Design brief:
Radius of gyration of chain A: 72 Å
Shape of chain A: rod-shaped
Shape of chain C: rod-shaped
Radius of gyration of chain C: 63 Å
Helix content of chain C: 55-70%
Oligomer: heterotetramer
Strand content of chain A: under 5%
Structural class of chain C: mainly alpha
Chains: A mainly alpha (201), B mainly alpha (196), C mainly alpha (233), D mainly alpha (190)
Distance between the termini of chain C: 160 Å
Number of strands of chain A: 0
Largest interface: C-D, 91 and 87 residues
Number of helices of chain C: 7
Largest sheet of chain A: none
Structural class of chain A: mainly alpha
Strand content of chain C: under 5%
């Protein structure tokens, strides 16, 4: 069974292998330089591990300030707390505790981006609205639209009929008068041709 | 099976020295200037969740001896995680909500403008600028709309006068023939001297 | 090319009146609201069930609350991620065919556009011609009034004039020329005037065989002056 | 005639929504997960009675009020009309019009704060032109008709008159008789 240091690096370095690999199948989107980069750092990382980087396994650190409800201490004499090595000729409490290099988050980024997005979008929108109101009240252009017997008469027919009656009437007067003057002629002729005889016998 | 016993301090120690190395190198492929958006910082995250995958996978063929089996391992990976960052910056997230609801509202506004504004403009014209039907239908509404006797008797008396002339000349055309005959006989009797 | 998806989101954001994401967000926020209300309400309304007889179980409930909570928060969150993916992809998606063809349009678009210059100029123009033609046709209607009145006027005038000429000339009168029909029994006036005229001509010959006032009166007084008889029984 | 029967889409929305819900409840109608979340208190008899009536309670209430919330949203958005109109519009655009428009424009917006307005105006005024031309065309028709009748009865005037004129012309030696009456008048008298 055991709980050994080598087998820890067997299993762990194995998980690192599989992790790299999976992340290489996930590197189908190569144009993301983040991907190529991260892969370089992680390959050189697993290499620098398998070929040593510094002291590694087991031990702890210092714990600094505690944080446990199970914190309860009780001891006695027999070797006090003063702890460190010594003896060997040639070659300190040993306290290099934890060290941190904090990294920002992700929601900060999504909120930066989304902020930019909503700023430019809402800008374009409110400006579109400007164009609407102004063009409406202005260039509406009221569509303006604004509009703007022959040769016949009583006297003519009565003049025709009267003309006929007058011409005819005049011709008639000419015939009748001709007969009158005629019988006045014959009249005379006989007035002097009726006294020649008288009569006598 | 295989069985690697862990203590919280062991696994957290390994994690923290991994982060030590990763920090050491990320500090050679780039200077310290942080905050870069889709670049640099995306790498940091990708490496975090990378260690999530690595260590989670590790706990499958490996157990803990502090609580029950491989329980809490992810809670301490995630407690050292939170020991970094992700303070949900309330103010920026508040800006996110403000500008998101503002985005929705302004959107609805431009929509109801794109329709309501043209349609109401054209409605107002089409309604007033149809007053041609005052003129036109005024029109089409209108298009549907629902002593001489003396003189006569005088020309008549002229006709009757001509008729009189007719009868008179007809009675006087025989008489003058007869009196003719008489006077021509007489004229032939003067040459003969009209005696006894 | 802008983006056919952006085009579908503009045409749909306009049609709907609200962004598509707004709907799915209302769905999510709603459900998760029921998740929180029902979580702290399961907890709350179960606090009265903590004691079971003698001992206290008030220390073994919040683990179930927290765990079940996170579990169904992630589960539901992802399930409705697949929802919204299905909504914005199948339901609220438009085929790129239509967007490319220029064939997809909205209710707004009883509208028809083009080279605005053409339709505006030709429109205003044509309309104006129509208006002036309206004016013309109206004035022409007035002319129709004129010729209607003229028409009927000539109706009465003619009817009265002719039933006059026949209630006058034909001797078929009401007041004047009834007289007698003997005058008109020889209805052709022409032949009459011809006959009398020509016979009168012949007479005018029978006298124009001269010997006029002087010839005849002198012939007479000559005769008488040549003396005769006086007196006899 | 209103293709696709309007629906086909809102129905699917209901489908996916309710299926995602019920397939998200799977963990509440399976008490094993409760055995995981309550190893000890879940084994208690009274406790598991409580969590039984309470699990049933949450399925029932959850499902009900969730549904009425979905319906409420559908009312908030009148999504029925929007989607039915969406499908309808799509298929009409599939089976209507083709050639009228020579070349086309982008339907997002070239710059369409105006193009929309001016478009609507110009179309509406096209309709105007149409009806106006129609009512005019009517005035022309009625006009030419009345002209037809008036000119008919006018030619009936001229015809009638001219006729009866030549009629009484058919019913009704000036010189030689002038010289006759002259020569005869030459005689004088006392």
């Amino acid at each position: 069974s055991f709980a050994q240091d080598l087998k820890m690096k067997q299993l762990m370095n194995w998980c690192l292998i599989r992790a790299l690999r999976k992340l290489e199948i996930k590197n189908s989107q190569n144009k993301s330089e983040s991907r190529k980069i991260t892969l370089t750092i992680l390959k050189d990382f697993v290499r620098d591990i398998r070929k040593g980087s510094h002291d590694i396994d087991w031990x702890x650190x210092x714990x600094x300030x505690x944080x446990x409800x199970x914190x309860x201490x009780x001891x006695x004499x027999x070797x006090x707390x003063x702890x460190x090595x010594x003896x060997x000729x040639x070659x300190x409490x040993x306290x290099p505790p934890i060290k941190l290099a904090k990294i920002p988050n992700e929601k900060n980024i999504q909120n930066k981006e989304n902020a930019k997005i909503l700023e430019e979008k809402i800008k374009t929108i409110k400006n579109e609205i400007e164009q609407w109101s102004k063009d409406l009240s202005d260039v509406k252009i009221p569509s303006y639209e604004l509009p703007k017997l022959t040769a016949t008469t009583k006297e003519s027919i009565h003049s025709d009929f009267q003309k006929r009656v007058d011409g005819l009437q005049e011709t008639t007067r000419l015939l009748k008068s001709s007969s009158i003057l005629l019988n006045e002629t014959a009249g005379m002729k006989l007035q002097r041709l009726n006294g020649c005889i008288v009569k006598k016998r | 099976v295989d069985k690697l016993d862990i203590t919280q301090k062991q696994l957290r120690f390994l994690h923290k020295q991994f982060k030590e190395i990763i920090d050491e190198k990320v500090r050679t492929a780039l200077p310290e200037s942080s905050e870069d958006d889709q670049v640099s910082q995306e790498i940091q995250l990708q490496l975090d969740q990378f260690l999530m995958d690595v260590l989670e996978m590790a706990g499958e063929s490996m157990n803990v001896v502090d609580a029950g089996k491989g329980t809490t391992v992810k809670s301490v990976i995630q407690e050292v995680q939170k020991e970094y960052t992700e303070p949900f910056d309330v103010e920026l997230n508040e800006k996110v909500r403000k500008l998101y609801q503002e985005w929705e509202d302004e959107t609805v506004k431009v929509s109801k403008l794109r329709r309501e504004a043209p349609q109401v403009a054209v409605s107002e014209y089409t309604k007033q600028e149809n007053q041609l039907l005052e003129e036109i239908d005024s029109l089409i509404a209108k298009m549907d709309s629902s002593k001489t006797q003396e003189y006569w008797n005088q020309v008549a008396n002229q006709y009757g006068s001509i008729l009189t002339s007719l009868k008179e000349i007809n009675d006087k055309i025989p008489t003058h023939e007869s009196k003719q005959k008489r006077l021509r006989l007489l004229l032939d009797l003067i040459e003969k001297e009209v005696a006894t | 090319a802008t983006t056919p998806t952006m085009q579908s989101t503009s045409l749909l954001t306009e049609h709907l009146g609200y962004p598509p994401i707004s709907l799915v967000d209302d769905i999510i926020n709603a459900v998760n609201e029921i998740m929180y209300k029902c979580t702290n309400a399961m907890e709350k309304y179960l606090m009265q069930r903590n004691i079971i007889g003698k001992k206290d179980f008030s220390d073994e409930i919040k683990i179930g609350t927290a765990k079940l909570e996170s579990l169904l928060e992630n589960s539901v969150d992802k399930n409705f991620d697949k929802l919204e993916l299905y909504v914005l992809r199948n339901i609220l998606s438009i085929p790129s065919d239509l967007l490319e063809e220029n064939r997809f349009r909205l209710l707004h678009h009883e509208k028809l556009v083009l080279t605005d210059s053409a339709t505006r100029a030709h429109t205003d123009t044509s309309i104006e011609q129509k208006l002036q033609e309206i004016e013309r046709q109206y004035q022409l209607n007035v002319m129709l009034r004129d010729r209607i009145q003229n028409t009927k006027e000539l109706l009465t005038e003619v009817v009265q004039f002719k039933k006059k000429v026949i209630d006058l000339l034909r001797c078929d009168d009401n007041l004047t020329t009834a007289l007698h029909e003997l005058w008109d029994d020889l209805k052709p006036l022409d032949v009459a005037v011809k006959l009398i005229t020509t016979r009168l001509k012949q007479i005018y010959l029978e006298n124009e065989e001269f010997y006029s006032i002087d010839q005849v009166n002198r012939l007479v007084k000559r005769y008488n002056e040549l003396r005769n008889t006086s007196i006899v029984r | 005639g209103m293709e696709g029967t309007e629906h086909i889409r809102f129905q699917r929305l209901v489908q996916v929504c309710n299926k995602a819900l019920e397939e998200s409840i799977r963990k509440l109608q399976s008490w094993e997960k409760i055995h995981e979340c309550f190893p000890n208190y879940g084994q208690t008899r009274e406790g598991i009675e409580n969590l039984t009536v309470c699990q049933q309670q949450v399925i029932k209430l959850w499902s009900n009020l969730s549904r009425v919330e979905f319906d409420a949203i559908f009312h908030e958005r009148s999504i029925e009309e929007k989607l039915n109109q969406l499908d309808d519009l799509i298929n009409k655009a599939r089976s209507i019009d083709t050639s009228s428009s020579s070349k086309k424009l982008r339907k997002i917006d070239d710059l369409r704060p105006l193009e929309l307005i001016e478009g609507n105006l110009q179309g509406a005024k096209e309709s105007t032109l149409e009806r106006i031309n129609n009512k005019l065309q009517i005035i022309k028709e009625s006009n030419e008709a009345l002209e037809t009748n008036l000119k008919d009865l006018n030619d009936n005037i001229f015809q009638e008159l001219d006729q009866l004129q030549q009629v009484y012309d058919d019913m009704l030696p000036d010189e030689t008789i002038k010289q006759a009456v002259s020569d005869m008048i030459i005689e004088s008298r006392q």
